[PDB]
Amino acid sequence: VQLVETGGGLVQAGGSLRLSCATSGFNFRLRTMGWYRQAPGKERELVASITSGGSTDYADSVKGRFTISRDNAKNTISLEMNSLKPDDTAVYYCNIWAPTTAAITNWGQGTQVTVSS
Amino acid sequence: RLNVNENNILREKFENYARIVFQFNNSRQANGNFDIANEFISILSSANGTRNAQLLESWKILESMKSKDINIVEVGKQYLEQQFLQYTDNLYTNVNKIKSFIDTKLKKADKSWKISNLTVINGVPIWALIFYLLRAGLIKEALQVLVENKANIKKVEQSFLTYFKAYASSKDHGLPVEYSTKLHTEYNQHIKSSLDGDPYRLAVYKLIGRCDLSRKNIPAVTLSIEDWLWMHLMLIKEKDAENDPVYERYSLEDFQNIIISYGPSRFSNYYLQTLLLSGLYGLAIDYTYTFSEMDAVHLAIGLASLKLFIRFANILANYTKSFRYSDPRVAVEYLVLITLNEGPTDVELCHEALRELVLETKEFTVLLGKIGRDGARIPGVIEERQPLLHVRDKEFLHTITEQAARRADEDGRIYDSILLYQLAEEYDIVITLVNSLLSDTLSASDLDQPLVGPDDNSETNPVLLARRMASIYFDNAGISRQIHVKNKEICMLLLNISSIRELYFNKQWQETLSQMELLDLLPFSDELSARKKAQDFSNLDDNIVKNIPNLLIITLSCISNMIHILNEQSSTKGQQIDSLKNVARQCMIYAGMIQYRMPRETYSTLINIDVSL
């Protein structure tokens, strides 16, 4: 398994960003996948998740503003982030969805997302 | 090159042997008292032929070794002595039974002796008596008879009595260097070269004193291979217990070297016993291979049971090859024997063999387990033998199940993959696979065919399977928690679709249409519903989008049948036909907006039904 999260960086409040994750080394199609965030100090939390067939589910924190999608041909997962807020500033990780976030124990490096102003 | 299934005879001993191996593992796990040697002793005694007697005595050799701290030289001597003693018992005090053996077989029909120059006192060849007592392990009796005859052996042998008492009253069965040098001088000066000397006297001197190690055999009293083995074994010392190594020495390796240099040519019907008694365990296994692979494999297990040790793991994994497919469970039984040697690589070799058995025979339910009706896992045979695997872990079992699952998925063995992911407790993946299988079934199976037949089951039928997974998993908080909320919802929606298809197949048009509207996928509601559902189309789950075409076909077809039925009375038939025609219209408008993401024939099928309304 390998999770190469790209996209993101610094952006002004109210702006837009699109995260992506190219995956390798496991069968992508069968796994529910999720996007997580880890604010400085705070623990790592689930933001959005998507089943094999493209059904999605969102934390209240980001509902209406974030959109998770996947491309089973390219083995990518994407997270469009619009109308961003400084409260969304965190490192973002893509990994298999699991009911309790602590149990993953198999992650990628992540992309830092920072929203100014 | 052995094939256990090639005849009744060659198949009947295999299960008889496998059944011993089976209760050996049982006591292994149960920390019990089972003794494999005496089980093979029981089975091998009834059979016969020369090799079987050969094999039978070899197990009696292994049996004698039991519960003894193992010194190769000591157990070998104890075996040959106890055998001779019981031989003189079969033939019939021990002393009187040996006396009778002497009077019988050392005498010719004349009453003449077959060995000349015997010192005979009261018709008793006393040195033959001393010797055969020693040959029977009866040391204290042997010293006893020498003592009673002190007044009949002059003074040259009188001194020997003191060396004997010393040899007898010890544990090493060695003599202090002041005694061994004195006895050797006396041996060389009076006994070794004597003209008319009793040959038993000479043997007893040589055995008790290790006199003149350059000449190890006294042929005149070496009457059998057992005697030859015993006399050599009697002369072996540890290297660090040689009083005069630069003058003379004899170690176990010396004894093994000459046994090897002679080869089987010189060892008659006794070479396997000879290799075993000399502690050449590999060679005894290898020699057994020349005439019975099955008996070789099992002799190796006997020797491994005694921590005596071609390589065990390969011995056990090679034997398994002819019956891995035919008999997966007994293959495990022999692979599990690999951790008898208790080695660092042995544990890992046993794991790799088991993984190879699972991945290759694909015998998942016997080897890995299966799911009961309630959802609870029944352990497979590998799991049942987990104690014998010396696992740090249950991680191993989990790891092998996941590997078989990904191979299953790669191969297209969907039912395999669904079973394996259940065993691996990968519950969200299971529902993912079940939803994908049911969805493909609903969209691809020709519409007019039935989905479930009277003889279908929950293991292989996609509708019955999904129903079973929904029943045993979704109402199990421990499991249901692990399935994403949308995977549960897609499963229930697909199942509602399959219920709609059954009603349709059964011509329940009105009730099909009502359940169809409850799906909340098609535009039943009003004019603006068509627009709303068309927009929703691009966001439907992959499992659902592909079933929209048949749902439209069922809907238009149900309406067409119901309008005919209504036109063949009632006060409001007109209003019900208008309402039905309204649903068809909204569905056709919806269909026309999504049709270029549908199969190219769907719209044409649809509108041909619509203009008949």
What is B64-126 written as a DSSP string?
A: HHTTS---HHHHHHHHHHHHHHHHHHHH--HHHHHHHHHHHHSB-TTS-BSSTT--EETTEEH
State how far residue A97 is from chain B, nearest Cα, in angstroms.
8
Instruction: Please report how many Cα atoms fall inside a 13 Å half-sphere around the Cα of residue B441, on the Cβ side.
Output: 23
Question: If DSSP codes are grouped into helix, strand and coil, which group holds residue B386?
Answer: helix
Experimental determination approach used: X-ray
DSSP B596: G
Q: Do B481 and A49 lie within an 8 Å CB cutoff?
A: no
Chain A residues lying within 8 Å of B490, measured CB to CB: 51, 53, 55
Q: Which two tokens stand for residue B456?
A: 């279908």
Chain B residues lying within 8 Å of A58, measured CB to CB: none
Q: Do B484 and A51 lie within an 8 Å CB cutoff?
A: yes
Chain B residues lying within 8 Å of A99, measured CB to CB: 481-482
- The total number of structural domains in chain A stands at 1
- Per the rule left: phi > 0, alpha: psi between -120 and 50, beta: everything else, B327 is beta
| Sequence-ordered alpha helix ranges (H) in A1-117 | none
Q: Give the integer Cα–Cα distance in Å for B118 and B116.
A: 6
Q: Which two tokens stand for residue A86?
A: 């400084």
Among B406, B429, B486, the residue with its CB nearest the CB of A57 is: B486
Domain that holds residue A71: 1-117
Q: Give the integer Cα–Cα distance in Å for B203 and B215.
A: 11
Say if CB B275 and CB B56 are below 8 A apart: no
Q: Do B429 and A30 lie within an 8 Å CB cutoff?
A: yes
State how far residue A29 is from chain B, nearest Cα, in angstroms.
9
Q: Give the integer Cα–Cα distance in Å for B468 and B457.
A: 10
Q: How many CB pairs under 8 A join A and B?
A: 48
B62 closest CA partner among B311, B304, B406: B304
Say if CB A67 and CB B538 are below 8 A apart: no
A48 has which bridge partners? A35, A58
| Backbone phi and psi for residue B477, each to the nearest 5 degrees, phi listed first | -50, -40
* Amino acid identity for residue B425 in this structure: E
Instruction: Please report how many Cα atoms fall inside a 13 Å half-sphere around the Cα of residue B477, on the Cβ side.
Output: 0
Q: What was the resolution (in A) of this experimentally determined structure?
A: 2.1
| Residue of B403, B422, B428, B491 for testing the chain A interface, max A β-carbons within 10 Å | B428
Say if CB B283 and CB B268 are below 8 A apart: no
State how far residue A112 is from chain B, nearest Cα, in angstroms.
27
Say if CB B21 and CB B337 are below 8 A apart: yes
Q: Do A54 and B406 lie within an 8 Å CB cutoff?
A: no
Q: Do B485 and A31 lie within an 8 Å CB cutoff?
A: no
Q: Do B482 and A99 lie within an 8 Å CB cutoff?
A: yes
Q: Do B432 and A30 lie within an 8 Å CB cutoff?
A: yes
Q: Where are the domains of chain B?
A: 1-613
Say if CB B474 and CB B506 are below 8 A apart: no
B541 in A contact zone (CB under 8 Å): yes
Say if CB A60 and CB A51 are below 8 A apart: no
State how far residue A105 is from chain B, nearest Cα, in angstroms.
16
B429 in A contact zone (CB under 8 Å): yes
Would you list the DSSP string of B445-468? S-TTS-S--TT--TTT-HHHHHHH
Question: If DSSP codes are grouped into helix, strand and coil, which group holds residue B206?
Answer: helix
Which residues contact residue B128 at a Cβ distance below 8 angstroms, ignoring those fewer than 6 apart?
B102, B106, B115, B118, B200, B221
How many residues are given for chain B? 613
Tell me how far CA of residue B401 lies from CA of B317, B356, B379, B406, B425, in angstroms.
21, 12, 13, 9, 10
DSSP B189: I
Place of tokens 């099909």: B512
Instruction: Please report how many Cα atoms fall inside a 13 Å half-sphere around the Cα of residue B327, on the Cβ side.
Output: 18
Q: Give the integer Cα–Cα distance in Å for B249 and B53.
A: 35
- Spell out where B459-561 has E strands: none
Place of tokens 């070496």: B222
